[PDB]
Design a binder for these strands. Sequence first.
RNA 1: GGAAUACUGCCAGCUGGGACUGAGGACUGCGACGUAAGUCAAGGAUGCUGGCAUAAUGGUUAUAUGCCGCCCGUCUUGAAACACGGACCAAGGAGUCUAACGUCUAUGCGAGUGUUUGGGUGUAAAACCCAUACGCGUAAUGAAAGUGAACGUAGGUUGGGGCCUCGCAAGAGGUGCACAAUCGACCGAUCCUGAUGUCUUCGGAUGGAUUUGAGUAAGAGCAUAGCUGUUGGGACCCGAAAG
RNA 2: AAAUAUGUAAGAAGUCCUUGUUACUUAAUUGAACGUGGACAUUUGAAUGAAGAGCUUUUAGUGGGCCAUUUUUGGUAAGC
RNA 3: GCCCUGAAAAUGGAUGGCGCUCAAGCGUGUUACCUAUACUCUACCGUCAGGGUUGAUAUGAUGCCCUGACGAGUAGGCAGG
Lengths: 159, 51, 185, 50, 58, 148, 223
Amino acid sequence: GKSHGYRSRTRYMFQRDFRKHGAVHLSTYLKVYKVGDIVDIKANGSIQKGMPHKFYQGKTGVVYNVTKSSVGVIINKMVGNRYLEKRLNLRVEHIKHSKCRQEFLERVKANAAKRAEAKAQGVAVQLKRQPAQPRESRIVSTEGNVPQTLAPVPYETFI
Amino acid sequence: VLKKNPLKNKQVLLRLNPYAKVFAAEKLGSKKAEKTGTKPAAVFTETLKHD
Amino acid sequence: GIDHTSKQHKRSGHRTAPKSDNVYLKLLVKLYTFLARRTDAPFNKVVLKALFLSKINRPPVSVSRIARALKQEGAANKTVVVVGTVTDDARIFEFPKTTVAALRFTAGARAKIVKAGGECITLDQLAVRAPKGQNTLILRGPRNSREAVRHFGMGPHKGKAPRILSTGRKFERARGRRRSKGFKV
Amino acid sequence: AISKNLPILKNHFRKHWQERVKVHFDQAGKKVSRRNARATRAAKIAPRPL
Amino acid sequence: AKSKNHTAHNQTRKAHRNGIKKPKTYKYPSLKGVDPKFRRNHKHALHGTAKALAAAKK
Amino acid sequence: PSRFTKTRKHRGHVSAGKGRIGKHRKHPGGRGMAGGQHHHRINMDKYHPGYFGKVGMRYFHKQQAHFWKPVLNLDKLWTLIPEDKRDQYLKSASKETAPVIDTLAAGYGKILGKGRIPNVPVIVKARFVSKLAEEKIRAAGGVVELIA
Amino acid sequence: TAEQVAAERAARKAANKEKRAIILERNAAYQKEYETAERNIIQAKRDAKAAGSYYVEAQHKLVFVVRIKGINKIPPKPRKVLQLLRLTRINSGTFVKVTKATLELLKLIEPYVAYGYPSYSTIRQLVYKRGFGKINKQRVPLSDNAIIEANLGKYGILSIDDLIHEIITVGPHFKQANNFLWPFKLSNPSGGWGVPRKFKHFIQGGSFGNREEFINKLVKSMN
RNA sequence: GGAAUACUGCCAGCUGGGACUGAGGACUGCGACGUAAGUCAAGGAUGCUGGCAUAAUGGUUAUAUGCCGCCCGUCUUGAAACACGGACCAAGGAGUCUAACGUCUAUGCGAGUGUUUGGGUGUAAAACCCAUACGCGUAAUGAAAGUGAACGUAGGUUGGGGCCUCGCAAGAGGUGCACAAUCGACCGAUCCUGAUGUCUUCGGAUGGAUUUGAGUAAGAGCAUAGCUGUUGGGACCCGAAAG
RNA sequence: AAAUAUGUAAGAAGUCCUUGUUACUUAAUUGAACGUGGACAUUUGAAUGAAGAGCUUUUAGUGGGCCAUUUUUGGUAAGC
RNA sequence: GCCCUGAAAAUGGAUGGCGCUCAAGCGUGUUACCUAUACUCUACCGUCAGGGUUGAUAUGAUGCCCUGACGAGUAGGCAGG
């Protein structure tokens, strides 16, 4: 009959990257984690302890606990018509600071600053992002760029 | 009690937006453009009529 | 047709009037809906609504509970309003003066309040004195203190009370309630 | 059959109970009797106390 | 008679009638599963800062 | 009364309230508490955790009220003196003429310790007191007298 | 009492006089704005030509979108988009400000709508004939400038022509102005769709997708 | 070289023909035209003329004509079905009542509440009256022996309606019941600590712990009634082969 | 190594400055948590929409499904 | 490309039928026209929502009045009759 073990379906998911097998470099053990940090989970199948179950591969949550060798992470998982709150104890080999929370904090600073120079000039700011806008009129010149005219091409076999 | 359409019925046309009075009076829904002579340059016609 | 985004002909989920047929209550209502409509004053809007509430949602406010609220800084002279009934409580000894407007006083509560030199007012009487609710303290009973609510949300690990009719060891205390008997909860 | 979140009742009626129901319609009657008896006992009890 | 065996058909229609909402977020969340030593010391930390706040009210 | 009854509102819909497919049949699932360990177990754990199995010691021929000992908290206590005579003792508050309170007379069997009492001394006759109960009476300058 | 009314009465009569004069000033100034923007663009083009260059016009900042499919059998994603754009009924239409975050919406929806670049004419007539505003839910015909000022005054915009201007120039309160305008309820086009089948693209023989300037002709016959 | 025309688009440019509608019911509004008094097509039709009386007209009904229209009820993914019941008509004919309950509501009283086993009384199964009890509630936790609810304005933090103060407004500060989240304290269980004592084995203060409870932390309940729902009952009605 | 689908973020529960508490932690008032006091509200931190948002209790029916485009398995195939 | 051969089944019979051959056939283009319980505007019924109004002043305050939107339905829930 059917088979649904814990690591069922995981052959390509927990595999190591091509020409990247072996010891895990120390950077991984030098990152510091704080309650409230945002991490992305991604299994390292060379470290079998403290390992996220495969549903959580590729998912991002919040740190809620810090321990000798692991962080606890809060993931919101959808079961039925409702998210349930899940907490995971992942070892550090399987976790990584979320890079987008970093752009975000950087921008919050940038924002505070833009606000500062604006006030200490007493001017309007405009701090929120606009999306890509239509495009304004241009004049293209023809100096050195007299348009080359093209036509469709006859069918032909190359075999 | 009854929506009247300013686009028929000049009365409510004038009620919303005066200006209409002057708009009409001065014409200007017609109104001649100025007149310039500007010619296209050689190259523009060379390539219009290219191949 | 229309791709409706929301239930059509849905009725606000709120009482619009008391379910009671007590003429007097309707009159208090008739009073307050004039007041609610014709003054600004958040107070009457609140008191209006509270008149519609069913009995489970007017839990009683007790006389010690009024004693306590009166100890709020800057509250001692407020007139305390209970859109429901006030009950006696042999547990406070020293009880202070004030003026309590309520729908109903139990006999002991009237006594208590009165004996301490205070006054018992009905809501229309409170209306004339305070058409805008000036210097009032609205109080509400503990609603989730009710026996019914002990059993809500009953389930594995929920910490709730079974709907049992009869209690002791021998009634729902064995398999599923202790590690030694199957599992625990 | 067991359903919903309800108390477990133990209503003992598995048994022909309908052959032994006692509805006391005689409540009022027996009382009038009890008194009429108390009356006439005291009667023949001369001035004794009952 | 054999009958049908499984399907998800209709299940998302059903989940989305009332469904999905999201988490139920609070400030001051469940300290469930947080390091016992740590918590035990947090207690004392909080007691003390409470103490002092009241000490600065004479 | 029957005229407020959905059975009247169902006259003319085939089938009463009960469905075309499922029918109202004559006991599916069995009678009474059938299959509580079988097809009715989900309802029975959840809803009735603890139901099956034993726990504890049997006791043959137990006589309720060998165990009679109804409790009264300090919390009340003054309620046992009647309303009128209550003000005087409260105000007087003397060790020389302090009120007896036969708690057993009043129907109680033990005085527990929830609550505060005013300072006033009280003579409390009871059979059984809690450790704290006696401690609060004494702080107010009354005593407990054990009776039976 | 018998006196007083004349105070408040001749007050507002006077207040009205001034409001009306402002609209007169404004409406005359928008005529100019428009008249010279358009003229500007025309001369731009002739000058480029004259320089042997090509003027290339600004990309459109604004579109009108009309839903043209009825309401059954619609896939969930376009269905949501149709609603977020307030298009939950066949032939109803709205204005959309074009940017990347909205352009990808129009893409998802393309089989179910016809859209394009509305002219002032078309906008003027859409708003005059079928302009209604949203005011405590309720849908209210814009039949006096007082109604517009009472809800849109807080952003400038105190006439129906103030409204048209915030629409056609897009610009700073377009969000709020445009939202105040209820979805336009168009009729079926008088004179027809001009194609044997609506549910192909305009490029493929017709209805659906961006027909560009040709939206004016279509909307005019629907309005 | 100078025009014209087409095509496409704009006009708050002017006009003809046809069709449906005419909701509202003193006045209030926004305007327009007037030098003016006034006028108006400006928050929904008026004016002038005529026609009909054993009638114009309207309802009904029968029939014809155009188009359209399969037999209901049932189970079913699918019935007009070459699935089943039903020839016709009257009368009869199926979710009840009871014991015990969940939720919600109304009502009485409220730390209590329930007169009706019984007594009193009577205009006699009614209505009126009541002593002692008892039930449920007001204490929990342990298998149990047992023990049993305030460090604190009955605690701290964050939201909170309402109220208070300043303010012409916007606002700002004060206080914040209900309710929600979180940290703490108190009672019992469990496991530790084991003081002052004592008869030497009793006693168990005090202080603790990712443990545990259907608890405490200024009570809500008791009772009557109704719909809906639960279980036992012939249990919505009618039906075995059997025993 | 796509396309389609998919996780998180886009702030008042935020930011910055000052310096309080602890039995944790550090060589270390060092960190970590939680705070006092002070400053910053026009676009306060993309878009579009919101027909109001949040929450609680309780209960019916159902628990034979079938069809189409597209993806797709068994089968020569099937209105399988 | 169109057309022809390849091209055999049982009652008599089906581009829906008649019939149609520079089509009433096949490919393509352009206009006009017909028509749904859909769209637009208006009346009326109901439902939901928001708002006004017994302040002293005859006859319904669960009433009167103003405004906007909405209407498919088995099993089934509730309501008003």
